[PDB]
Amino acid sequence: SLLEFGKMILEETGKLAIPSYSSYGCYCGWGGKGTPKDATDRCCFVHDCCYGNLPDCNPKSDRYKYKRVNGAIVCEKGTSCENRICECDKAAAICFRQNLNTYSKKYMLYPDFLCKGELKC
Numbered sequence: 001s002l003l004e005f006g007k008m009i010l011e012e013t014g015k016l017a018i019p020s021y022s023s024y025g026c027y028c029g030w031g032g033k034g035t036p037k038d039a040t041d042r043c044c045f046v047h048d049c050c051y052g053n054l055p056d057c058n059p060k061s062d063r064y065k066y067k068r069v070n071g072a073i074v075c076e077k078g079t080s081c082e083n084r085i086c087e088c089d090k091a092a093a094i095c096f097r098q099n100l101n102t103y104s105k106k107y108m109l110y111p112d113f114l115c116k117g118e119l120k121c
């Protein structure tokens with residue numbers, strides 16, 4: 001759930017998921033339209049696609065557990081859904097971290113109306 005994902009984001013980026021990544025660009029929020037503004041926004045686009053491929057689950061709501069070994073996130077053994085949701089979240093948190101170098105404040109509080117157009121996964 002948002003709880004676990006937010007924890008990973010803080011651990012990997014040093015930033016609080018909300019509000020640092022909850023209104024970023026076109027995809028880091030609830031929206032999902034248009035061309036991703038940058039690398040960070042693409043991380044969210046990919047995250048949505050990952051979630052979108054878990055139709056048999058409830059990604060944004062389902063709770064799950066994970067741990068850190070050797071300084072890296074390790075999705076622990078749980079239900080199929082729990083494990084997959086965790087991996088989608090892990091990939092995104094790491095993606096945010098790898099791209100902090102281009103994280104731009106100007107994309108925060110980004111209005112959805114500026115994002116239109118269907119972008120296939």
Ligand SMILES: Cc1c(C)c2c(c(C)c1O)CC[C@](C)(CCC[C@H](C)CCC[C@H](C)CCCC(C)C)O2
Binds near residue numbers: 007022028045
């Ligand atoms: C679909 C989709 C959703 C729904 C989404 C985001 C993105 C990119 C998406 O593509 C990012 C932001 C937000 C608005 C996100 C995160 C939740 C809170 C900040 C949770 C954090 C929890 C903390 C650390 C737990 C700390 C635990 C320790 C103190 C033990 O949710």
